[PDB]
Write a protein that binds this ligand. Structure first.
Ligand code: NA
Ligand code: NA
Lengths: 251, 250
């Protein structure tokens, strides 16, 4: 199943998306009501209203073989404000002064139940599903501030979507980022330094996680700049593709 | 005017708090504390209810270094605390078993009153509901280790807020004081802020949209220090009152 939010002519609905052909249907909601919008008629929004967004930075091994092996250091987690969230096909707006601003394609965990102190092995019990995220980052501000929050916290700097997949096996799916059709990031989640359960364990040991909260699981190598007029597309195997145009704000 | 949130026999309510003696009264404000307040006509004695965190912030922004001793300051460094860290007056700060030391950091807190973005420092007060007190509780060992300060300052209960929001306060030059078990740890005045309230609202709203209820912690003076199981921490701001929390180690 794929869960998400859509903008209809009747308004906003939380829907179930079913079908891979453009004869695709969004059915409203789980108890279904009966109203059906084709996917063609409506527009996908960010699939959930997150109270907070937690992200990790360094979380991909370079290659499977190294290592392995020796335990990775503990995760470093941080927050992006939920005001940064935008959905598919919404422009990423670059600050006039921010150079360079980087794309960071990531697999996103969506929490489905309130939780605290969850053991890594039980993480799936509290996970609604998986979607795609982009941890857009003003790299200059990162270096100036030390704290990464401002750099990653601007409005539109957290694209999320296109929908939430509830039955995905996210253990070994391909993640890739394209800029204007050009592949710039490519890895598999089998190379996650801290896997999904470890991240949920680490994060819920720190703070209460609420239904809707998002945990971005990190980005592999290849992070690179995005400029006015670019299109960034992040594809996760078994989920789909999150696409956003890019515009720079005037001075 | 003092605006708070209370737990009453009738549920949770926003209130105007009136009086300082034993017969203080809480006057119910309809739905939220933001516009011109609408009084329902319902009220409770303060003695009959319990003050909660005065606002349900969608987010909490904070700054690190922001008081002069008594050099030109570097630009503000802001970060986030999750709103799941917020607790109200008298609620125990719960220390993680493995965190040492954990420090108190008494601060003046801005509460945003209107949605906004790209606010000029000069006009910040037009967008500010009022001022309350905060404690930016920080696990120092985690802070140093992580580089990023979020985890160190993001544990459940690591953001005491309260006891209420004062709407007609001139915060230009008020005393800020932190006591632990009756001993003064921190004491300074807001006239020593490196980045004043205006500069912080300007800086933060240039980055992100702020919502009514959002909180900006304006930093802490010298004298930060450890808290431990059994301690009581009290932060006082002249013109607001005192935010007090006991401390327990898990
Ligand atoms: Na004001
Ligand atoms: Na602080």
């Amino acid at each position: 199943m794929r869960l998400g939010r859509i903008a209809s002519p009747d308004g906003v609905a939380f829907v179930s998306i079913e079908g891979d052909g453009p004869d695709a249907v969004c059915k409203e909601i789980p108890n279904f009501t009966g109203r059906s919008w084709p996917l063609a008629d409506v527009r996908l929004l960010a699939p959930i209203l997150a109270s907070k967004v937690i992200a990790v930075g360094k979380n991909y091994a370079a290659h499977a073989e190294e290592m392995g092996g020796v335990a990775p250091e503990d995760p470093v987690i941080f927050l992006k404000p939920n005001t940064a969230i935008i959905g598919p096909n919404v422009p990423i707006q670059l600050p006039a002064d921010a150079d360079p601003v980087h794309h960071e394609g990531e697999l996103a965990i969506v929490i489905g139940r309130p939780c605290k102190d969850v053991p890594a092995a039980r993480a799936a019990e509290f996970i609604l599903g998986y979607t795609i995220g982009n941890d857009v980052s003003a790299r200059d501000q990162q270096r100036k501030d030390g704290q990464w929050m401002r750099a990653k916290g601007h409005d539109t700097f957290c694209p999320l979507g296109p929908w939430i997949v509830t039955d995905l096996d996210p253990s070994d799916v391909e993640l890739r980022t394209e800029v204007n059709g050009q592949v710039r990031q490519r890895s598999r989640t089998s190379l996650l330094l801290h896997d999904i359960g470890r991240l949920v364990e680490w994060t819920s040991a720190v703070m209460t996680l609420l239904p809707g909260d998002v945990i971005l699981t990190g980005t592999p190598e290849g992070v690179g700049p995005i400029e006015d007029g670019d299109t960034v597309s992040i594809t996760v195997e078994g989920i789909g593709t999150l696409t956003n145009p890019v515009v720079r704000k005037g001075k």
